[PDB]
Amino acid sequence: GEEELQENQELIREKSN
């Protein structure tokens, strides 16, 4: 389905410290 983008925003979460 649409798991690509589901994951990318979680990568913005990881940008955290």
Swiss-Prot record:
Residues with Asparagine amide modification: N17
| Residues included from the entire protein | 81 to 97 of 100
Where on this chain does a divalent metal cation bind? E3, E7, E10, E14
- Family stated for the protein in its record: Belongs to the conotoxin B superfamily.
Spell out the residues of the site Important for selectivity: L5
Compositional bias ranges of the Basic and acidic residues kind: 10-17
Its UniProt miscellaneous note says: The mutant Gln-9 consists of the addition of a proline residue which is hydroxylated (4-hydroxyproline).
Task: Return the protein name.
Answer: Conantokin-G
In this UniProt entry, the residues modified to 4-carboxyglutamate are: E3, E4, E7, E10, E14
Top-rank taxon = Eukaryota
Consequence the record notes for mutating L5Y: Little loss of inhibition of NR1a/NR2B receptor; 70% of inhibition of NR1a/NR2A receptor
The tissues in which it is expressed are: Expressed by the venom duct.
